[PDB]
Design a protein around this ligand. Structure first.
Ligand SMILES: N[C@@H](CCc1ccccc1)P(=O)(O)C[C@@H](Cc1ccccc1)C(=O)O
Ligand SMILES: [Zn+2]
Length: 866
């Protein structure tokens, strides 16, 4: 009797809602919501079924008290007119009691909403599904001194005052929308005003709302929005469609931001920065996410989702758009590698684990569990493959046809694919499998130069996943090139064209590609630009990898050669540590890294990436009976070797980076590149010479010229067993006690430390006056960081597992979304060595045994355990 939602069961709704008129009467403590729905029968005579979980005060049909039944979270009216009719629902909400941060809730003494995916039903009774689109008008009444700012979607068309100190506003959004895009804000908030003029000459008023204290940190977000608006015009030909665009910052928020039409609501983390309190990465994040939410105005809002299985239709596409925006801003190659690295570090384990799902899932119990790395980041890689197959011009032809066909509609992934296919006159039927088949495809490649042909044989395979065993061959673009003995590009003939690069389109289980007219011995460069989201196996020698790393023209393949050398070095460490003998010499790797360190032609941020070692999760990919501490030990040994071996050169590279930064402490991509390299150097220095922390501490103020430097130094020393580490962290918390986003950084350092005493420091931090478990940013920073802290989470005595399971249980009582994300710390369960596996299963069984456990957490626990 447990409810599962299946894509195969989709049916159009029995009723449409043409008009949604809302009235909010905000009081202390309760808010009363009145709705009036103009309902249009589609299947005449069916019962009207409304979703809702708010306290119900009354229901009318055509103005008279309705005969209805309330059952669970539904309201059913059996006796429906056969003609257009209205329904009026009155509900009552206590927003200060709402710690789920879905629906209408309080934060910092103000009121905010979050409705995606199914939060609107926590406000009123509604047909709360995204293929039902309605024109909203929203009236808000509140005390003026307490709630001077009253916002909802669209245009402000009326307002006024009452003699008792109350005031009101009325907002009309002329664009039909699904309920998940509804927003309301009521509060005492400061505003920052700006504008943008569209290419048709229309001014758009821009308003950012923040606390009074936070206002000085919102400027970069405003600038980023104007950049995003211009970019969507120049790159996609897309113009904004209202004369007002509002953004509201909120400190209590389950995700990063939300694209509500004309009234975006952002986590403070993705809108507030200055150089004193935010890192360069934080600035890049604001640019990315402000872009993302604005880009949803077309890819999400103007064209929306038929059903929640199609989430990647808007999210994969909009992530692709924010990636392209950021790459067009600056540093495209480095940013592309950053994106690839995040996918392989976080999404690949998802696809290999118990919660693996297709980009377009076929079923779900709780839709909030499917806002995933797969739907978003793999979703974006799928959209990018259209770009790779079609080119920018062809891709834009597809976009044009997509909007022509589907503006104002709620559609499917299939419709996006068809627009791409039809606009370009190409068959993309096989491409559909990128949406329906889960798992990381594995390509096995072999190469031979015989006659004057380089014959590249490639096989593909996709593993069964828990949802599906049968996996058919997919359409996989493999971008390639060839290097001669001196690492020079070598031209070849393919499909009657002589070039140095080609896209090989693998569509069968096994294919041979003939690169003809090759006049010299070659080493192939494969999967350039990470041209498909796959695992590629090709037999490279260490010397082949050094060649690629030294001379290849593609950023990804150069970086992947280094990643491979690191991976092989860790594997060699695993072996020696296991045999109880001396560590390997790693002579070739050390020679390779020396070259990278000493190369002054390398981009600084690219050099920093070449000096990064794959994470433990990457290293144990594909393994069984995993002891995570053995992998941690082997990785730490490699980092120690790199730190100590090159210690003088790490200091020298640091000095060179400092000189080039040139005291330009504000955010810019140029200065940030130097600081990124500097922070890599700091990490290695303080590994090799932990005593250097006292030298750092002595001159801390001189060093602390922005938060990128403070964060970089505190990160570097965070695992140091000196008392000074603890003192510097305490001083950081004191300095920045009043800045909640910097206190998030403090708590992340507490939870992530490799020091031996981290569990007890974490437990003390739970009682820190600036910590709140009910704040998702804080919970994520402290507890989330601890759950990803390999030696502590995976402690042999099980203390890490017991602690995280305790917190899943505690958090689930008020915020199931946060708890269900946290409990995925346990996803490695069935791949662990027996002792830890036993303890993880005990932890999961204890979570399962909780009375009233959320559907959110229960769905995840079932996938891991059952
Ligand atoms: N549609 C929004 C998520 C909806 C939601 C559901 C429940 C609770 C709160 C909000 P989004 O995709 O635009 C926000 C997204 C922004 C993002 C994602 C990937 C890259 C860059 C930006 C981040 O939170 O992952
Ligand atoms: Zn999004």
């Amino acid at each position: 009797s447990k409810t599962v939602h299946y894509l195969k069961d989709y049916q159009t709704p029995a009723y449409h809602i043409l008009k949604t008129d809302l009235h909010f009467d905000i009081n202390e403590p309760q808010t009363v919501v009145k709705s009036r729905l103009t309902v249009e029968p589609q299947r005449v005579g069916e019962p009207l079924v409304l979703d809702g979980s708010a306290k119900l005060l009354s229901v009318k049909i055509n103005g008279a008290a309705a005969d209805y039944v309330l059952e669970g979270e539904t309201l059913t009216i059996a006796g429906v007119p056969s003609e257009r009719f209205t329904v009026e629902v009155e509900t009552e909400i206590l927003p200060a009691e709402n710690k789920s941060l879905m629906g209408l809730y309080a934060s910092g003494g103000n009121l905010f909403t979050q409705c995606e995916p199914e939060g609107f039903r926590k406000i009123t009774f509604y047909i709360d599904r995204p293929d039902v689109m309605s024109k909203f008008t929203t009236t808000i009444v509140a005390d003026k001194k307490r709630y001077p700012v009253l916002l909802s979607n669209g245009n402000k068309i009326d307002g006024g005052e009452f003699s008792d100190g109350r005031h009101w506003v009325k907002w009309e959004d002329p664009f039909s929308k699904p309920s998940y895009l509804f927003a309301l804000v009521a509060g005492d908030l400061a505003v920052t005003e700006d504008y943008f003029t569209t290419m048709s000459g229309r001014n758009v008023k821009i308003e950012f709302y923040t606390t009074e204290a936070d206002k000085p940190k919102v400027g970069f977000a405003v600038e980023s929005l104007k950049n995003a608006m211009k970019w969507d015009e120049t790159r996609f030909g897309l113009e904004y469609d209202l004369d007002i665009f509002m953004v509201v910052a909120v400190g209590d928020f389950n995700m990063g931001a939300m694209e509500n039409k004309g009234l975006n609501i952002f986590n403070t983390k993705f809108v507030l920065a200055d150089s004193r309190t935010a890192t360069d990465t934080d600035f890049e994040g604001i640019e990315s996410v402000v872009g993302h939410e604005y880009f949803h105005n077309w890819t999400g809002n103007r064209v929306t989702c038929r059903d929640w299985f199609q989430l990647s239709l808007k999210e994969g596409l909009t992530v692709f758009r924010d990636q392209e925006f950021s790459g067009d801003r600056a540093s495209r190659a480095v940013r592309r590698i950053e994106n690839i690295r995040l996918l392989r570090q976080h999404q690949f384990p998802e696809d290999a684990g118990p919660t693996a799902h297709p980009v377009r899932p076929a079923s779900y119990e709780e839709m909030n569990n499917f806002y995933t790395m797969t739907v978003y980041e793999k979703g974006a890689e799928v959209v990018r493959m259209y770009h790779t197959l079609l080119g920018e011009e062809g891709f834009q032809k597809g976009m044009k046809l997509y909007f022509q066909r589907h503006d104002g509609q709620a559609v499917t992934c299939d419709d996006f694919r068809a627009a791409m296919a039809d606009a370009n006159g190409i068959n993309l039927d096989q491409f559909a499998l990128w949406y329906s088949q889960a798992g990381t495809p594995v390509l096995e490649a072999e190469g031979r130069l015989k006659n004057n042909i380089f014959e590249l044989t490639v096989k593909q395979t996709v593993p069964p996943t828990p949802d599906m065993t049968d996996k058919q061959p997919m359409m996989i673009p493999v971008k390639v090139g060839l290097l001669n003995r001196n690492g020079e590009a070598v031209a070849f003939d393919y499909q009657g064209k002589r070039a140095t690069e080609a896209v090989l389109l693998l569509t069968e289980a096994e294919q041979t590609f003939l690169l003809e007219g090759v006049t010299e011995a070659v080493v192939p460069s494969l999967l350039r630009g990470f041209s498909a989201p796959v695992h590629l196996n090709y037999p490279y020698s260490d010397d082949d990898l050094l060649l690629l790393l030294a001379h290849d023209s593609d950023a990804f393949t150069r970086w992947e050669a280094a990643q491979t050398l690191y991976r092989r070095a860790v594997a060699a460490n695993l072996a020696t540590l296991s045999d109880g003998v001396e560590l390997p010499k790693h002579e070739k790797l050390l020679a390779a890294v020396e070259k990278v360190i000493s190369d002054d032609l390398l981009d600084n941020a690219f050099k920093a990436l070449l000096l990064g070692v794959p994470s433990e999760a990457e290293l144990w990919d594909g393994a069984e009976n995993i002891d995570p501490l053995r992998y941690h030990q082997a990785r730490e040994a490699l980092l120690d070797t790199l730190a100590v071996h090159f210690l003088p050169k790490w200091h020298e590279l640091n000095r060179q980076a400092a000189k080039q930064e040139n005291q330009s402490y504000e955010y810019s991509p140029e200065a940030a590149g130097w600081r990124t390299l500097r922070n890599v150097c700091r990490a290695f220095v303080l590994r090799a010479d932990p005593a250097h922390i006292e030298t750092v501490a002595e001159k801390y103020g001189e060093m602390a010229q922005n938060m990128t430097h403070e964060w970089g130094i505190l990160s570097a020393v965070n695992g140091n067993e000196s008392d000074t580490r603890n003192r510097l962290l305490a001083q950081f918390a004191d300095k920045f006690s009043d800045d909640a986003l910097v206190m998030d950084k403090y708590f992340a350092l507490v939870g992530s430390s490799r020091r031996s005493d981290t569990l007890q420091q974490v437990r003390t931090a739970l009682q820190h006056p600036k910590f709140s478990l009910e704040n998702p940013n804080k919970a994520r920073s402290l507890i989330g960081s601890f759950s990803r802290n390999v030696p502590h989470f995976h402690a042999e005595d099980g203390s890490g597992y017991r602690f995280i399971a305790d917190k899943v249980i505690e958090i689930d009582r008020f915020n199931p979304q946060v708890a269900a994300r946290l409990v995925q710390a346990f996803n490695l369960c069935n791949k662990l060595e027996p002792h830890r596996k036993n303890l993880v299963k005990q932890a999961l069984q204890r979570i399962r045994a909780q009375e009233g456990l959320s559907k959110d957490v229960g769905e995840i626990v079932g996938k891991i355990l059952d």
